[PDB]
Structure 1
Amino acid sequence: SRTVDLELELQIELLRETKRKYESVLQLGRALTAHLYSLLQTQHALGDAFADLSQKSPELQEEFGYNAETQKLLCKNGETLLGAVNFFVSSINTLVTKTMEDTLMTVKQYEAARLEYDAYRTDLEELSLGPRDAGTRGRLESAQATFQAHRDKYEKLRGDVAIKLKFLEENKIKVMHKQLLLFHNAVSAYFAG
């Protein structure tokens, strides 16, 4: 009936859509982290190989030597970036798999009350246009009460969603800002070293 539910289902939609989007970013993020993890372990092993080859071969020692520093250094920094990426992961994860899941816990209950609101809306209409007898006048009144009961359930939880989306969107933007920032800064800091 109302304009609110039409504007709400619209926003519900948008929340669900952008969730899967962040789960992709999260997915890809953890892929990259594992990638980086592999890289450093190799870099460490190659540093140590270059280092050993430097000590055993006087004729070529400088060439392996400074190649061994560079690999070793790159991991030391990689091992730092790896941390930052991980910290990005869990923060986003909190937003995605916890913070918004809290809103979806409520979104479902909102819909549970809605479906209930309509099944009791039907009963009222099926009876107000049906036959009459002892067991019609008495029946419409106990339909009204239960219709109005679930109305209240529906109205309150509709109100409650609007609140949780309003407070999500704000917090979502905060976390996102701070993470997309500490993400970028971590990448550049890595090259800076």
Structure 2
Amino acid sequence: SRTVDLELELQIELLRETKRKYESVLQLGRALTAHLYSLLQTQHALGDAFADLSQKSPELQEEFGYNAETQKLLCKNGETLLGAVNFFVSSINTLVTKTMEDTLMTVKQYEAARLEYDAYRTDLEELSLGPRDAGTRGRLESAQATFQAHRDKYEKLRGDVAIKLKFLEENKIKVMHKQLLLFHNAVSAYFAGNQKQLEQT
């Protein structure tokens, strides 16, 4: 037997799974970030190399310079898509690292108080077994205070949670829109802007 709040608890469970899912997405984004930056530096180097060869290889100057163009192209077009991912990632991090962490902060608080409320309650039930004498009543009095108090902190915090939860879910949707968008846009904008120059030259 333990104080349970089926609705809140489920509500709280969801926030935790969401947060975990959102963290592994934040992980994949930073991975994607690290890799793009690597591909970018390698395409700059490759660009310069194909350059140097074109200038030094008349028998093949076209092919080398041709390829040296795309490479340098794809580079400036990558630095962009990159800064965008750097943005998407940085955004979702805040939503997770601070926006969500603050709510989860109140949950751990609520959960701890809940644990204590049940402890002080149980102490009181225990003393109730004792004889109806004077001395036991004195203790049931002390025990009654603490108990009531701890019931207060519990119920308040349980309130501060259902509230914060609602507000948070507001952002989870607002923030994850502007972001899930810009991201996907920057993506198709990268390829688009790139083909527009690859067909030309």
TM-score by length of 2: 0.91
Taking every aligned residue pair, what percent have the same amino acid on both sides? 100
Q: Kindly provide the CA deviation profile for residues 132-191 of structure 1, in whole angstroms up to 9, marking residues without a partner as x.
A: 322122222222222111111111100000111000000111111111101100110100
User: Unaligned stretches of 5+ in structure 1?
Assistant: none
Q: CA deviation at 1:21?
A: 0.7
Distance apart, 1:15 and its partner CA: 1.0
Residue matched to 1:84: 84
SS in structure 2 at match of 1:106: helix
- For 1:121 and 1:89, the matched residues in 2 are separated by 46
Once the two structures are overlaid, the 10-residue window that deviates more, 118-127 or 142-151, is: 142-151
| Aligned residues between the structures | 193
RMSD (CA atoms): 1.7
> Aligned in 2, Cα 1:65/1:78: closer, same or farther, shift over 3 Å?
same
Stretches of structure 2 that go unaligned for 5 or more consecutive residues are 194-201
CA positional deviation for 1:76: 0.6
Residue 131 of structure 1 deviates from its aligned partner by 2.0
- State the 1:121 CA deviation: 0.5
Structure 1 position 5, deviation (Å): 1.6
**CA offsets per residue over residues 58-78 of structure 1, 9 Å max, x none?**
221111111111000001111
Residues 186, 3 of structure 1: alpha-carbon distance in 2 compared, 3 angstrom cutoff: farther
Give distance in 2, aligned partners of 1:40 and 1:183.
Answer: 18
C-alpha spacing 1:142/1:3, structure 2 compared with 1 (3 Å) = closer
How far does the alpha carbon of each residue in 1:1-53 deviate from its partner, in whole angstroms, 9 at most, with x for none? 99982111111111111111111111011111111101011111111111111
